[PDB]
Design a protein around this nucleic acid. Sequence first.
RNA 1: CCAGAUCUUAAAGAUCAAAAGGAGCAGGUAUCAAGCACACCUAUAACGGUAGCUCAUAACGCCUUGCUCAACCACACCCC
Lengths: 175, 112, 72, 58, 51
Amino acid sequence: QDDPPPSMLLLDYQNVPGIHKVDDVVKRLLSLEMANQKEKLKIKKMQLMNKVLENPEDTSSLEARIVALTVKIRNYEEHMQKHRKDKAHKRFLLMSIDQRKKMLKNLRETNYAVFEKICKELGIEYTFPPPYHRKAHRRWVTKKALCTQVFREVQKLKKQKRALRAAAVAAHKQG
Amino acid sequence: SIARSSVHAKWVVGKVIGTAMQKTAKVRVTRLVLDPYLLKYFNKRKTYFAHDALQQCTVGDIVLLKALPVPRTKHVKHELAEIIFKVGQVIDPVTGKPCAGTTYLESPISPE
Amino acid sequence: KNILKIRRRKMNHHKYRKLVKRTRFLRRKVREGRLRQKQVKFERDLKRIWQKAGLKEAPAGWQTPKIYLKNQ
Amino acid sequence: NPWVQITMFKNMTPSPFLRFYLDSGEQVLVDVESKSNKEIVEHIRKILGKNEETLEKE
Amino acid sequence: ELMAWNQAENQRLHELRLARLRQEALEQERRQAEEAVLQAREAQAWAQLKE
RNA sequence: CCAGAUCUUAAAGAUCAAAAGGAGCAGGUAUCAAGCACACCUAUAACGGUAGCUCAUAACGCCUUGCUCAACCACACCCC
Ligand SMILES: [Mg+2]
Ligand SMILES: [Mg+2]
Ligand SMILES: [Mg+2]
Ligand SMILES: [Mg+2]
Ligand SMILES: [Mg+2]
Ligand SMILES: [Mg+2]
């Protein structure tokens, strides 16, 4: 997560010369104080790419787009935490995650070195798509739990059989 | 010089599915099979087990497999030979230069 | 016109919705009866698992839940 | 060639090519970047194809 | 000998590829220069209004 | 791929081919959708270690049935 400082000139009114010589009044009118959420995203996107990307001037690169989507994904999550019953934005959040997931897979199969750096910097955790998407109903999860528990119990029966029964035979040898 | 095998496949090329087990990679071989009715070729997927001694398999690779002279179990009958295309790290066999899909990572016309 | 088919499907649904209402409690008895056999058959399936695995008793701490039971 | 495995790979190498794996571990690399449909078949038929005399005597 | 011929054939095509890439690379630099002037012209215009 | 049995003989040729294995092909049914130990490593041919394997391209089930024919597969009262 990132936190743009409040008293910073917005993206556009930065490179123009002669700003620091202006009085505090105009600097206040251009800072993030008098700018809406839209201007905040620009500063987040500008800073984020300058920290992880190699060539910021390239926008068509996959890594650049993944950074752009991550900014929107974080923005949607903040909106979702406030407006919980909103369904239009929840759909956007899920589709944005799926698009980033699809683009991360494409980046991995082309440039592994860049994919590793993007995955580490942004904190994204890439999980392989599990085969055979099935709905885990109560009957299946119950029976699966029993089979795993029975499997562990069989190991204990054999493990103690390996210890005690062999020792009993070895008792005759040792005497 | 008797080091033959009884399997019908001596050399095969397939994609790595997973590397969950110890020093063994499950690969998926693809072949073309003619449909008798439509007279068209479709892919048929089969899963093979290959023994990787160096643990060099990453999911998504294309691996050449060599038939094992003696099976090590009822399923492992093939041994990995080479990594044809490392995932994400693909070097063009012609120019011997790193590449990422269509765009060359390094220009082959720039020796220095 | 196609109304000769919607009307035929209208009458059948209207008569079925009266067969359920007239014998509502008969279906209640059968539904609960089938649910008990559904639960019992599930118990035998789990009982078969541990008996064939060599165990004598079910693993400790395992009480089979009643999945086909009314809850909320 | 019913017993020869043929596998396709799309958009992995900027330069199209064909690779042949022999029984003795030999690798044959065929480079195609401007050759037409007909040229490749004639090129393949000569590097690894069978001779006409061999087929007719078989 | 067929293997030897095929090896020479790849080398012959490789020389053509290296020559052709230089032509593409030279054109790419020309395209980059034209893009740079267009971007610089728009950069100057945009900064004037912000000032 | 083929041990083994047999025949011939200059002990290396041939006839039949168990077991085991797989490029592909192979009845109906998904209202049979999950099977429940079905994997692998080390050295041992133990122990120890990893937590995996098959499956919507049909696993696991159920029903019907000799066959792809110089012939092949199976049964020899019943409890495979
Ligand atoms: Mg009716
Ligand atoms: Mg046999
Ligand atoms: Mg023999
Ligand atoms: Mg003999
Ligand atoms: Mg039914
Ligand atoms: Mg009998």
